[PDB]
Amino acid sequence: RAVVDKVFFSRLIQILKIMVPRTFCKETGYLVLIAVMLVSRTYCDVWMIQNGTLIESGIIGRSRKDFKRYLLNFIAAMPLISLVNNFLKYGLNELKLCFRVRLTKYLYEEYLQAFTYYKMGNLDNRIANPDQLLTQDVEKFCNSVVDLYSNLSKPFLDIVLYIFKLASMMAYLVVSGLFLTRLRRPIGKMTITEQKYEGEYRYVNSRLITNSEEIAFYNGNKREKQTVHSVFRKLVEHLHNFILFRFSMGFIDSIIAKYLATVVGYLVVSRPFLKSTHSELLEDYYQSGRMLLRMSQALGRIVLAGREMTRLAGFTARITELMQVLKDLNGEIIIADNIIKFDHVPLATPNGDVLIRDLNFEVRSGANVLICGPNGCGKSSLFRVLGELWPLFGGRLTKPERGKLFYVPQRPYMTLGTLRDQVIYPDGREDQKRKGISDLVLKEYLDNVQLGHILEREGGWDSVQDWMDVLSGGEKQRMAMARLFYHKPQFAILDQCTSAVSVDVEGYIYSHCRKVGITLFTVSHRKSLWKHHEYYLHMDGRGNYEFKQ
Amino acid sequence: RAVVDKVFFSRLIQILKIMVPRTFCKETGYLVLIAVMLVSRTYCDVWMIQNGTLIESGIIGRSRKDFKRYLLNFIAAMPLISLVNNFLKYGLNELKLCFRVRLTKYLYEEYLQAFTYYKMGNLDNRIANPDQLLTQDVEKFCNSVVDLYSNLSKPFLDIVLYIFKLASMMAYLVVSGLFLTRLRRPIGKMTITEQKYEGEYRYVNSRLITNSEEIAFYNGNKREKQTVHSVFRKLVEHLHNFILFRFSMGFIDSIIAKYLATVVGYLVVSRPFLKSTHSELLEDYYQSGRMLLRMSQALGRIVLAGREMTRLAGFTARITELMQVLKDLNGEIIIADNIIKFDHVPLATPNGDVLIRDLNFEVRSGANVLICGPNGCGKSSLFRVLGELWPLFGGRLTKPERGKLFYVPQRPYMTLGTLRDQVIYPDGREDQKRKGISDLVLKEYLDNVQLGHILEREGGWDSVQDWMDVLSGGEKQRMAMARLFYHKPQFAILDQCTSAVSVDVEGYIYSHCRKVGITLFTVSHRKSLWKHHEYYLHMDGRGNYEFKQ
Ligand SMILES: Nc1ncnc2c1ncn2[C@@H]1O[C@H](COP(=O)(O)OP(=O)(O)OP(=O)(O)O)[C@@H](O)[C@H]1O
Ligand SMILES: Nc1ncnc2c1ncn2[C@@H]1O[C@H](COP(=O)(O)OP(=O)(O)OP(=O)(O)O)[C@@H](O)[C@H]1O
């Protein structure tokens, strides 16, 4: 699940392809910039030592100009040195930000393209809490993928650069890579579960905040505290195992990489010190052996920084799993114009179970339909099948496209934004007038909001600082009623518009509905709205339905 | 405001005390362990450089035996000298985890103690997205606070333990910390706003996930994509200025801290080399001024690591606001026993508006009350005032208690967990039998769930893998009806029981309700449930009521 091998590299290439898509794109200039201002640094660090070993020597004898004037160059190279360092830093962080932007854009365009933000979750249980796998996991993956750059690549143009100056068979990375890896697999395995627990904790908090009024009424403070501490203590308890494992890792990661590296370096550098027969004043080692031990230290630092690789396997496994949002692919629907038909389609829940297995009926744009029954017999699930929310697993089905068809769900929804956008949820604001017909929001909508909605002076046409769906009350489902009269659909399908009002304004909405060519298809548990309806289509929990007039 | 000054230190102390309660706690020993394993680690380098200079001095000659016997000591010390480093590493992040645990526990016990998880937000708008400020902000703050240790403390004692061997007037921190800070102020406010934008982005994603079905029915994929990409681009556009400021800061921060420090060290160390009269073979500089330039490097590194201080100003200035949940302190309430009184109490919304100002009614244990009226006239807001959800605002009222009372909110709520816990939401499971009367879940609760709930075989008494409030349907509000009969309160204040079956189950619930002595206080828009009710108390949108029979 986090093993570093061929499959991991393939699963990393398949996600790197979508980022830096082309040649010399907007962000491919950072793979070159941090490939030129980074090598310039590793030529500027040997120069740091070279001036370092030639400055103190200057101030040894009674020489002032050999240090005063000599030191000046260092002060002259300080601006360039710092500029190179910070240019590398900026290139790195800008590259990670651009990587994140591209990955997020791809994931979103692939994640809201259809009824897939709904299927992930309520329909399919394969990924838990997707609101964190593409908001916090993407950021961490972008941060880590670049940090495997500049580390395992920064001490890479330091072995070759030192090799430029230079029998050295000290390729002990062969035995310190096969070892010191495959011993760090638990880090990759359990970074995934740490992320999972963090996501669950955050989701519990968010759910508590969301329905913070129902919980308040029930006085469930103690129960909610218990059920949150249950998942918090399930997190830190695991972090203790994770944190204590990194200690057991550093012990072997600091006696085979950071310290034993210098031991082998000393062992190899001093092989020809028992040709250079005499090398009278044999301080040449300071310019040919010191560099060798520095190279050995960098070679050890390579594998030492290889730690970030396995900690990235978990992130890659998590995100590459989120790229099973290709369920966009994994009976038939006929695109009719005026008649909604149901040819022996057994409606069913997402799992395997049939509520009503006949559903042999149809409607036309001349007879408002009202359907009733007990609570829990494929009533609100009929629309989910008619709409592309649930599968069909049946015969034929016809509907008037999707533009000339409106749905009001069983539960209210007020989008976040301005009041105007509440009347127009789907289209938006620019489409409201520019792309489509120009509706005078100043005046044309007050008639569309003639449902007794006095909440127009209550905030003005553009009120968002004090707006939400926790403020309207029970009239936020008749605010959805003032959405048909703007969308003017050929067919309107209403799921429990009741609970708005008994008689004061319930009749007004329906009277206006068939004062326009809006054929109605409603569910309601009432006897005071049958006057403006024609057909019956009554169904019960016995698996059979009665279609009458 | 994230300026590093007296107020910041005061605010850091006031929240440091809550994670160091007593002397030698479960984590107060980590301030000792990482204080002796850290000073025992600065004995590694000093021992490393001394030995490091020792070996090759033994290989300048051809003494194989000397080098061998004087290298084995390094092999022997490798285990201890790596164990010390890794023990510092473990004691470091274990301390941050403990800090996080204590801070989270305090914040939660202070945040779920009353109806404050509700007041924060719906009632008060002072903190936005409280679900991220105690889930992600706390973790980052704990990580940062310790990282100001081992950095500004790791090099702190590398200055006193180098002074152990030593005219050192190079105290230029006075001019390099007064400068180079107050020139980094933007980082604090800018990390604060970055955290704000990240929280808003995550909240938008969570809100999209929560009511995904409603969004799917409206076909609002395009609108939701637009409103998400609007706040994502509002974030990365700011991270661009953030990482374009760090480089603009790193430039100045790497020519006054990391390289000019070396220049000043070379300048000061050279003063005597111009009273060491002759010191023939002046190699003593390798141990009498090399340490001096190392000390200057560490002194520069102190101010360089001072960067984490200002980046920690933002987190502290953020969390200190979340510790304004002291609104728990921010008319009259009388604990009567059997009368829900209302003496000239003007019910009002959280803001400064009044809906009805008389409210001079009362009820008794033998008079069920059903109230109605238009939609949007303090109907469901009467309970929010009767219950301690909204301010009393004046007048007087008396209620029996909070234990022998019940509220069914207008919107349904099924807590996450098992099916059994759905019936017992507030009390939980342990209290279901131990702290209170023992109810036989296998048999006793079937009669308590005699409301037509056929979901006895549907998952079993303990089903959580396939449970949620997005699965029940219209029966998740009458599952709250099969939750009043278990609490058996004095009065049952239920709200919008409608959308349950009109006749099949509506009559059964109310007939059973008055069989047991639970006086019903209900709001509904119906005529089929008025038979089992006594008093009108009709409500209107003109601030008046009747209270007839
Ligand atoms: N996600 C789901 N998976 C499986 N079964 C579900 C799911 N959601 C609901 N159900 C069950 O499937 C059937 C759906 O009933 P349904 O929601 O359609 O009608 P209705 O909505 O019951 O009428 P009402 O709105 O009044 O409750 C019921 O058996 C319901 O309990
Ligand atoms: N948080 C809030 N702040 C200010 N006003 C609110 C808030 N919530 C609701 N309101 C408004 O306050 C009044 C309370 O209405 P209320 O919720 O009481 O309607 P209702 O009585 O619940 O009727 P119903 O349940 O059918 O709507 C209404 O004016 C409502 O629009």
What residue spans define the domains of chain B? 332-414+468-523
Distance CA(A352)–CA(A483), nearest Å, equals: 35
Pair of tokens at residue B251: 């430039």
The pair of structure tokens assigned to A145 is: 């993928």
Classify domain A334-414+468-546 by CATH architecture.
3-Layer(aba) Sandwich (3.40)
In 3D space, the residue among A479, A496, A220 whose CA is nearest the CA of residue B409 turns out to be A220
**CA-to-CA dists, residue A28 to A35, A102, B92, angstroms:** 11, 12, 38
Cα dihedral B118, B119, B122, B123 in deg (nearest 10): 160
Q: Is A63 annotated as a binding residue?
A: no
- Cα angle at A147 between B82 and B143, to 5 degrees? 65
Contact assessment for residue A415 and residue B223, using Cβ atoms and an 8 Å cutoff: yes
Inform me whether the C-beta atom of residue B220 falls under 8 Å from chain A C-beta atoms.
yes
Q: Is A206 annotated as a binding residue?
A: no
Question: Does B78 contact A259 at a Cβ distance shorter than 8 Å?
Answer: yes
Q: How far apart are CA B100 and CA B146, in angstroms?
A: 11
DSSP character at residue B433: I
The two tokens of residue B294 are: 């190392």
Task: Find the residues whose C-beta lies inside 6 A of ligand 2.
Answer: A 471-475; B 349-351, 355, 375-381, 410
Beta strands in A295-390 (DSSP E): 334-336, 340-343, 347-348, 354-356, 361-363, 369-371
Residue among B78, B223, B470 minimizing CB distance to A426: B223
Q: How far apart are CA B403 and CA B198, in angstroms?
A: 40
Between helix A68-109 and helix A39-53 the angle, nearest 10°, is 160
Give me A419's structure tokens. Answer: 């009041």
What's the farthest any 2 CA atoms get from each other in chain A? 116
CB A237 within 8 A of CB B97: no
Closest CA to A438 of A447, A426, A429, A446: A429
Q: How far apart are CA B129 and CA A171, in angstroms?
A: 53
In chain B, which residues are last before a break of more than 2.5 Å from C to the next N? 166, 274, 330
Whole-number Å distance between alpha carbons of A293 and A302: 14
Residues A178-183: contacts with CB under 8 Å, at least 24 apart: A179/A256, A180/A252, A180/A253, A180/A256, A180/A257, A180/A303, A180/A306, A181/A4, A181/A303, A181/A306, A181/A310, A183/A249, A183/A252
Strand order in the sheet with B519-523: B369-371, B519-523, B491-495, B405-408
Rounded Cα gap, residues A131 and B132, in angstroms: 13
Question: Looking at the partner chain, which of B101, B228, B407 has a beta carbon nearest the beta carbon of A217?
Answer: B407
The DSSP bridge partners found for residue A16 are: none
> Residues of B comprising the binding site for ATP?
373-380
* CB-based contact A93:B243 (threshold 8 Å): yes
Tell me the one-letter amino acid at B226: Q
- Looking at the DSSP assignment, which residues form a beta bridge with residue A406? A492
Establish, for the pair of chains A and B, how many residue pairs have beta carbons separated by less than 8 Å.
369
Chain B residues near residue A426 by CB distance under 8 angstroms: 218-220, 222-223
- A121/B contact by beta carbon, under 8 A: yes
Tell me how far the alpha carbon of residue A197 is from its chain's centroid: 16
By C-alpha distance, the chain B residue nearest A413 is B214
- Measured at the CA of B236, the angle between CA B235 and CA B239, to 5 degrees, comes to 95
The secondary structure of chain A in percent helix, strand, coil, rounded to multiples of 5, reads 50, 10, 45
> What residues of chain B lie within 8 A of the CB of A56, using their CB?
266, 285
Beta strands A491-495; B362-363: pairing state: unpaired
Distance from CA of B377 to the nearest CA of A (A): 10
**What's the half-sphere exposure (Cβ side, CA atoms, 13 Å) at A487?**
28
Give the Cα separation of B217 and A118 in Å (integer). 10
Q: How far is B389 from chain A (nearest CA, A)?
A: 7
DSSP B474: G
The DSSP symbol for B541 reads T
Per the CB < 8 A criterion, the answer to whether A99 and A19 are in contact is yes
Query: What beta strand segments (E) does B327-416 contain?
Result: 332-335, 340-341, 347-348, 354-356, 362-363, 369-371, 396-399, 405-408
- Which experimental approach was used here? cryo-EM
B500 C-alpha to center of ligand 1: Å? 13
Q: Which residues contact A338 (CB under 8 A, 6 or more apart)?
A: A364, A365, A400, A490
The answer to whether the beta carbons of residues A345 and A396 sit under 8 Å apart is yes
End-to-end CA distance of chain B: 60
CA of A426 vs chain B CAs: smallest distance (Å):
5
Output DSSP code: residue A61. Answer: S
Count of residues for chain B?
549
Sign of CA dihedral B2, B6, B11, B12: positive
Name the residue of chain A whose CA is nearest to B452's CA: A375
In order of A67, A71, A79, the CA distances from A76 in angstroms are 14, 9, 7
Q: What is the resolution of this structure in A?
A: 3.3
The response to whether A380 counts as a known ligand-binding position is: yes
Task: Name residues whose C-beta falls within 8 Å of residue A322's C-beta, 6 or more positions apart in sequence.
Answer: A107, A127, A130, A133, A134, A137
Task: Give the side-chain half-sphere CA count within 13 A for B358.
Answer: 12
Say if residue A79 carries a ligand binding annotation. no
Q: CA–CA separation, B242 vs B492, rounded Å?
A: 55
d(CA B265, CA A197): 50
User: What backbone phi and psi angles, to 5 degrees, belong to B78?
Assistant: -55, -50
**Which residue's CA is the closest to the ligand 1 atom numbered 9?**
B471
Give residue ranges with CB within 6 A of ligand 1.
A 122, 349-351, 355, 375-381, 410, 496; B 471-475
* Residue B157: closest CA among B288, B38, B294: B38
In this complex, do A208 and B117 lie within 8 Å of one another by their Cβ atoms? Answer: yes
Three-state SS at A406: strand
DSSP string, B260-323: HHHHHHHHHHTSS-------SS--GGGTTTHHHHHHHHHHHHHHHHTHHHHHHHHHHHHHHHHT
The answer to whether A307 touches A254, Cβ cutoff 8 Å, is: no
| Gap from CA of A466 to ligand 2 centroid (Å) | 14
A377 is in an annotated binding site: yes
Q: What are phi and psi of B474, to 5 degrees?
A: -80, -5
Query: What is the rounded CA–CA span in Å between residue A216 and residue A292?
Result: 69
Element (H, E) at A113: none
Helical spans, DSSP H, in A387-474: 419-423, 430, 444-448
Residue A549, classified by CB atoms within 10 Å of its CB into exposed (0-12), middle (13-18) or buried (19+), is: exposed
Residue with tokens 């360089």: B304
Q: Among all chains, which residue has been given the structure tokens 């986090």? A: A2
Tokens in use for A542?
Answer: 């016995």
DSSP state of A275: -
Which CA distances in Å does B531 have to A168, B301, B484, B498? 99, 82, 21, 15
CATH topology of domain B332-414+468-523: Rossmann fold (3.40.50)
What single string gives the DSSP state of each residue in B66-80?
A: HHHHTTHHHHHHHHH
Token readout for B125 is 């708008």
Cα distance between residue A445 and residue B244, in whole Å: 46
Provide the 8-state DSSP code for A475: G
Helix/strand/coil for A163? helix
